[PDB]
Design a protein around this ligand. Structure first.
Ligand SMILES: O=P(O)(O)C(NS(=O)(=O)c1ccc(-c2ccccc2)cc1)P(=O)(O)O
Ligand SMILES: [Ca+2]
Ligand SMILES: [Ca+2]
Ligand SMILES: [Zn+2]
Ligand SMILES: [Zn+2]
Length: 163
């Protein structure tokens, strides 16, 4: 449980698609950040994420600037980094990233893998944690990524929804 209304996916093998990229990183680096972000949740649950290259996926990932069609505009550099929709059809599950950020795979603001991993919590039905060590805490902070695994609070959360 946790996002109000307990929205959750009805099946556990979900597809994803990366619709576009960011000039800040190579295409492979974005693919890797996203893949590894999904795998964080997969190893703590029965969820299995399968990538498609084109067409209709459960979870769309894209980089957009300012107004981008969903009435939740981005805000330029810094501030809002990304957002994601609760499980559901259509825009449900989808994760958008502010294309005006410096996106990294380093300690420098902002690490794409960490932001994506947080947003995918929302895509799967988690709200914010009050545990300051949780991935689902409301404010971004860098932590070491080379061997990263979900903080225990986030494991508690995904298990509460999906086992
Ligand atoms: O401005 P929004 O309310 O859409 C938030 N987006 S955000 O860009 O302010 C944001 C995104 C990721 C994080 C984050 C937190 C912990 C670790 C990594 C990233 C924090 C804030 P949300 O997706 O968390 O509800
Ligand atoms: Ca921004
Ligand atoms: Ca969707
Ligand atoms: Zn959006
Ligand atoms: Zn959040």
């Amino acid at each position: 449980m946790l996002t109000p209304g307990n929205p959750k996916w009805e099946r556990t093998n979900l597809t994803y698609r990366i619709r576009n990229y960011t000039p800040q990183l190579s295409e492979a680096e974005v693919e890797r950040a996203i893949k590894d972000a999904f795998e964080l949740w997969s190893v703590a649950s029965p969820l299995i994420f399968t990538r498609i290259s084109q067409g209709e996926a459960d979870i769309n990932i894209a980089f957009y600037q300012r107004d981008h069609g969903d009435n939740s505009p981005f805000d330029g550099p810094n501030g809002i980094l990304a957002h994601a929709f609760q499980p559901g059809q259509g825009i449900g599950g989808d994760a958008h990233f502010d294309a005006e950020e410096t996106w990294t795979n380093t300690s420098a603001n902002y690490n794409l893998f960490l932001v994506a991993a947080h947003e995918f919590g929302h895509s799967l039905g988690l709200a914010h944690s009050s545990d300051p060590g949780a991935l689902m805490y409301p404010n971004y902070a860098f932590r070491e990524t080379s061997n990263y695994s979900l903080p225990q609070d986030d494991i508690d959360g995904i298990q509460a929804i999906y086992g």
